[PDB]
Design an enzyme around this catalytic site. Structure first.
Site: not given
Ligand SMILES: [Mg+2]
Length: 246
Positions: A10, A12, A140
Site C-alpha cells: 500500500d 499512503d 482535505r
C-alpha cells in the site's frame, strides 16, 4: 540471486507518513530490499498520478511493479502490462445512469466546502468525492474531520447502494475525501493475476485489513502472506526482518 519473492505495498500510511511524501529512509529500505533480490511493488486504490505525487516522478524506476486503481492499470519494470476499462464491465448506459445519480446526490449535500472533480472516471473505476478532488490540502484535512463526524461518504454510498443494488458495484472508502466504485472482483486482489505465476511468495503490507477495509480482500487472499501495518515505520521494521531471513 533473485529471491522469487514479491513485497507488495500500500502507499499512503504504509510507504508514507499519513498524507505525506515517502521519506528518505523509506526509499533506502526499498533499494536495500531490491539489492537483496526481492521484487517490490505498489498497490493503491488511487490513480497513477497520486503515486507519482507521494513517491516521486521516477516511481516506475523505484518499483518492479506499480499497480494503480487496484491493478486496473498495471506496470512491470516500466512497461504498461494492463489497462482495464469500466465500459468492459458496466457499459455506457449504466455508467451514465450511475454518474447522473451521483451528481444529484452531491449537489444536494450541505457541507462546508465544495470545489470540483466530484465524479472522476478513471480506467476501471469511478472515484466519488463530496468535496471534490480539486480542493486544497487544508480543505482535505478539514473534510476528513467533517466526514469522521457526519459520515457524509457513508450516507452517499448508502444512497447509491439503494439506487443501484443490481449494478453489483463495490464501494470502497479510501484516503481523506472520496471512495472508489468498481465491479465486485476489481478490488486490490485484481493485481494478483499479474504476479501469481512469477513469485514463490507474495507478501502484502497494508493498514485497512478488516471487513470493509480497502486492504481486506488482498490481505486475506490465499495468494498473499499478509502483514498488517500501522505506519511506514512498522513496514520498514517488518521488511528488515524479511531481509535478515533472506
Ligand atoms: Mg493473504
Amino acid at each position: 540471486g533473485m529471491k522469487r519473492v514479491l513485497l507488495l505495498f500500500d502507499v499512503d500510511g504504509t510507504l508514507t507518513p499519513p498524507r505525506l511524501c515517502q521519506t528518505d529512509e523509506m526509499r533506502a529500505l526499498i533499494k536495500r530490499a531490491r539489492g537483496a533480490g526481492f521484487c517490490v511493488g505498489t498497490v493503491g486504490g488511487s490513480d497513477f498520478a497520486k503515486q507519482v505525487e507521494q513517491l516521486g516522478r521516477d516511481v516506475l524506476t523505484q518499483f518492479d511493479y506499480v499497480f494503480a486503481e487496484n491493478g486496473l492499470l498495471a506496470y512491470r519494470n516500466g512497461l504498461e502490462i494492463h489497462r482495464q476499462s469500466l465500459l468492459n464491465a458496466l457499459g455506457n448506459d449504466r455508467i451514465v445512469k450511475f454518474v447522473k445519480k451521483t451528481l444529484r446526490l452531491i449537489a444536494d449535500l450541505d457541507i462546508p466546502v465544495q470545489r470540483g472533480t466530484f465524479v472522476e472516471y478513471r480506467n476501471g473505476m469511478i472515484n466519488v468525492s463530496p468535496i471534490g478532488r480539486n480542493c486544497s490540502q487544508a480543505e482535505r484535512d478539514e473534510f476528513e474531520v467533517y466526514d469522521n463526524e457526519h459520515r457524509v461518504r457513508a450516507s452517499l454510498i448508502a444512497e447509491l447502494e439503494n439506487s443501484f443494488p443490481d449494478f453489483g458495484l463495490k464501494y470502497s472508502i479510501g484516503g481523506q475525501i472520496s471512495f472508489d466504485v468498481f465491479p465486485v472482483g476489481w478490488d486490490k486482489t485484481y493485481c494478483l493475476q499479474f504476479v501469481e505465476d512469477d513469485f514463490e511468495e507474495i507478501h502484502f503490507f497494508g493498514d485497512k485489513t478488516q471487513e470493509g477495509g480497502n486492504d481486506y480482500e488482498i490481505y486475506t487472499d490465499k495468494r498473499t502472506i499478509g502483514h498488517k501495518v500501522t505506519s511506514y515505520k512498522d513496514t520498514i521494521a517488518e521488511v528488515e526482518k524479511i531481509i535478515a531471513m533472506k
